[PDB]
Design a protein around this nucleic acid. Structure first.
Lengths: 78, 67, 92, 97, 95, 67, 91, 82, 104, 92
DNA sequence: CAGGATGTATATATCTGAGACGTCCCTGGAGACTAGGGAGTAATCCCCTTGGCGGTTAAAACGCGGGGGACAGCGCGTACGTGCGTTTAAGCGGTGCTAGAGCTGTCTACGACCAATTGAGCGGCCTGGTCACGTGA
DNA sequence: TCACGTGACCAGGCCGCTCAATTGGTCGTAGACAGCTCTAGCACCGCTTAAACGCACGTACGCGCTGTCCCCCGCGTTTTAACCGCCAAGGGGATTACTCCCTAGTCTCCAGGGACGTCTCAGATATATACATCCTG
């Protein structure tokens, strides 16, 4: 579940971002934000999968969801 | 030619509103002022009737709650 | 001769508020909204057909496009209306 | 005698026009029978929702018509239409209070 | 020996801006993905490529959001990112 | 020239009556489109209040008599 | 000081008319277009459409700028606020 | 054929736009910044508008050209066409 | 002979003609349209490849990996904005440490 | 039998750099880039042809589309590239 | 500000999968011919774009004083960082297994096309429904 | 002062027509359903260990308060130019018509590019050392 996305993981992502020090409360907010993002993308992925009469989620479904949301992702067969 | 029908319907409506406020003033014999003042009377009297109804409801509901 | 939905917005509007009217610019905006959503759904249906190597746009395409284009409750109601209309059409 | 498709489906939007726009618009090589009906029902529902919310918005005021202001208020007030029309600018709509 | 606060943070920034690997753990992320998908259809299977595309998109999104959050914090005259900063970034970006 | 004076006094008359009528409609939002509609709604409201007041007084009399 | 600023604020927010003058906007638009093609002609509805788009864009950018100013614990908007808004919004 | 037009977006106009957005105090430097931002936005939209115009072999920029240019930028507009 | 060679290109002009024809864009695709599109696509591919190869040499590598593509795209002010809404797997990020975070 | 631009991308790379290579992931990224730009240009050209009431997507539709899609210097250079290609094709 | 401590940048064997090259092939692009449908050019014509002239008026521009709010500085008290030890799960490689992805092939039902008939709906003329005003005793 | 003739504004009805929608039949193909192969997604397991969790100590900065003063806001006055109407000319887009050449469709054929195999070397791991940067006293 969400708690598997640990504090050091958020620190690492933010360091790639460029932050020097991190408020103790960014962690929960980041977990919420990521959960919302994942839910939004996974909805469209599962919608495409259902349409294709499939029962397996394929990389092209994720690529299509991302391209839909204006977040085009290169490198996975799109 | 076409003017007559339009003016007659306008007359019909305006005199209808006149007679309507007249029946209200028969039901509202407290100001007997001009048409605009009589409309003001209607407004104020309706406001006071609403407030009086709500006030009597509240006060007698309190009396009922007492017994 | 222009093509518009004006007559249809009149008919739909009078159903819920018979006495209410619509201004010209309001009708223009409503027509643009209808055309916009039409284009959105049609494009999504075209993409759905293309991805599955399919040549036909059918009811399933429109349904999935609505599921993708509209938010939750509004999409649910749209799906209900579409299924109902299709059923009433075919039943005879 | 002849019966319009919209009458068969119980709709007010024209099934024939939508179907013509579907084939002629270069969306696919073939268009199914049931696509126009589903699409037209969806469009009709959305228009009806806009109209109901805008009528309520105009009824908050005393106006007898819907002017772009009330379409704006209807769209922004409701989270649904606001998300759907997040990038839509309505001329003469202004902003909410 | 003990570095003063801030040195290690900049070292980590340099390391993670040079490097290109993924940052979230793969198995915990996959578990989260499946848990989320459970609420749309039951008994979904996932390709590895699909899970990896999801993770890459998510990481890039979070990194960009944190860049904006850092910008907002700096605008506020601070050096620490606080939830108000994430909220401002997301509000302006439209989510 | 003084006809202009009559003109603005008439404009003020119209403004005041329209404001009063708007107050009525805000009090009785049932119908607002046409003057006849507002008058009819107000008249129905007044009749209803009168009947309810009569009933309330008569029920209070019975309440007092029986207890 | 600032008492009637709120008066102006809610007055303008309640209304739905234009705010920038019309002829100045028309002239600015023509001058801008001149760099792309000379002897150009503008449909009047096109100019009004441009005006509506521009006013909507500026109003939105100013709401974002105000959020930034409040974030800075200020009530005055300053250039760095507009810059932060635009930078975050991808512009 | 004229210059000095960017000054046509006067101080009060910028003030009114700021107030409609909820700003209750402004600095003196905001006016040039907003003039520059509006200039950039208008150039960016008119580019595409004049492109759509020239493509069709027309000398007048139609309101639909503005509509589609704005849509291409993602800022759809309802009221003037489409 | 090949139509790609006939027009002094390397990309598959005929393949693009088929893509335009069958990809549901119009009832009719003109003869020169596939040639134009092939040329433009080839130019873009050449530009991006040249920048990425420069990045790889600047890093003493012989092959182009997604890091080099990311560096080539994000350093170039126009090839960036053409791809500002795109994320590239294993691209990382450009180094960016704000001055306000610097020591002292 | 999956189509791909791998061979063409590889040849275009070697036309300028004799020994540089492309990994599989970079190859996929470049292929998806080419396909994405194809889709952008083609969709814009289709919209242009529809707007002008034309049933044909010609090289001029592609020229207008490439100007709209690409930024400044890229648009100019790609326009020159396309015009040279079409001229060499038509002259022979 | 010099000196020590940790760290990042520079220079070497082994190995090892993964790019790269040769071959088989098979199917999609190239050559040829066709018919008609769209593109293209010319001529019309009527709207609507531009241009000009005045008056009125709203709005803009300029000046001035008084806040009050931006900005800077000092004190501080905790919240975040850094670091060491413990431990928890990830990661990896292997083995089994079966659901379901992917492809093939009849084989029907459905959608495209044409011809025919006709009703929906646009546009314009016209009639009533509405509020509001200028007028007279 | 009371009360009232008249016109903007609009909804709706109705008809002309006219141009796309509905109906009916024919012919072809795509996709539906059945069936088969077999890829890879999933389940479990053991082992190594790298990252995570927790707790401790310290000081740096987020915050509060307090001052200075500057520059923005409200308001009075001058001026300027926007705006409204109203009239002119014309040029440019919308439209109709006809010609013809360009492209979609069909037929044949074969080499261009994809799939599959094998192979060596470019990069990864590991190790060694050289100079840099930081923090202390």
């Amino acid at each position: 579940n969400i708690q598997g996305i640990t504090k050091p993981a958020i620190r690492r992502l933010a360091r790639r971002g460029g932050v020097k020090r991190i408020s103790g409360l960014i962690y929960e907010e980041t977990r919420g934000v990521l959960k919302v993002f994942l839910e939004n993308v996974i909805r469209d992925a599962v919608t495409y999968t259902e349409h294709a009469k499939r029962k397996t989620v394929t990389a092209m479904d994720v690529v299509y969801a991302l391209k839909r949301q204006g977040r085009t992702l290169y490198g996975f067969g799109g | 030619q076409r003017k007559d029908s339009h003016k007659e319907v306008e007359r019909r409506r305006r005199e209808n509103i006149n007679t309507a406020i007249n029946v209200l003033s028969d039901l509202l014999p407290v100001r007997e002022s001009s048409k605009a003042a009589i409309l003001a009377c209607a407004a104020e009297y309706i406001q006071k009737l609403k407030e009086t109804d709500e006030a009597n409801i509240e006060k007698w509901t309190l009396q009922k709650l007492l017994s | 001769r222009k093509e518009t939905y004006s007559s249809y917005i009149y008919k739909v509007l009078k159903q819920t508020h018979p006495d209410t009217g619509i201004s010209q610019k309001s009708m223009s905006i409503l027509n643009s909204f209808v055309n916009d959503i039409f284009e959105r759904i049609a494009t999504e249906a075209s993409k759905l057909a293309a991805y599955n190597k399919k040549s036909t746009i059918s009811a399933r395409e429109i349904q999935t496009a609505v599921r993708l284009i509209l938010p939750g409750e509004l999409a649910k109601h749209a799906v209900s209306e579409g299924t109902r209309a299709v059923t009433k059409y075919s039943s005879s | 005698a002849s019966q319009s498709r919209s009458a068969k489906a119980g709709l007010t939007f024209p099934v024939g026009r939508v179907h013509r726009l579907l084939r002629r618009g270069n969306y696919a090589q073939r268009i199914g029978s049931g696509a126009p009906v589903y699409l037209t029902a969806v469009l009709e529902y959305l228009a009806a929702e806009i109209l109901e919310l805008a009528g309520n918005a105009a009824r908050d005021n005393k106006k007898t018509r819907i002017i772009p202001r009330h379409l704006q208020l209807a769209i922004r007030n409701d989270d649904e239409l606001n998300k759907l029309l997040g990038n839509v600018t309505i001329a003469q709509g202004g902003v909410l209070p | 020996h003990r570095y003063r606060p801030g040195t290690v943070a900049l070292r980590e920034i340099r390391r993670y801006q040079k490097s290109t690997e993924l940052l979230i753990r793969k198995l915990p992320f996959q578990r989260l993905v499946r848990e989320i998908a459970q609420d749309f259809k039951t008994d979904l299977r996932f390709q590895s490529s699909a899970v990896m595309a999801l993770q890459e998109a998510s990481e890039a999104y979070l990194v960009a959001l944190f860049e904006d959050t850092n910008l907002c914090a700096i605008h506020a005259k601070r050096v620490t990112i606080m939830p108000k900063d994430i909220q401002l970034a997301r509000r302006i970006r439209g989510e």
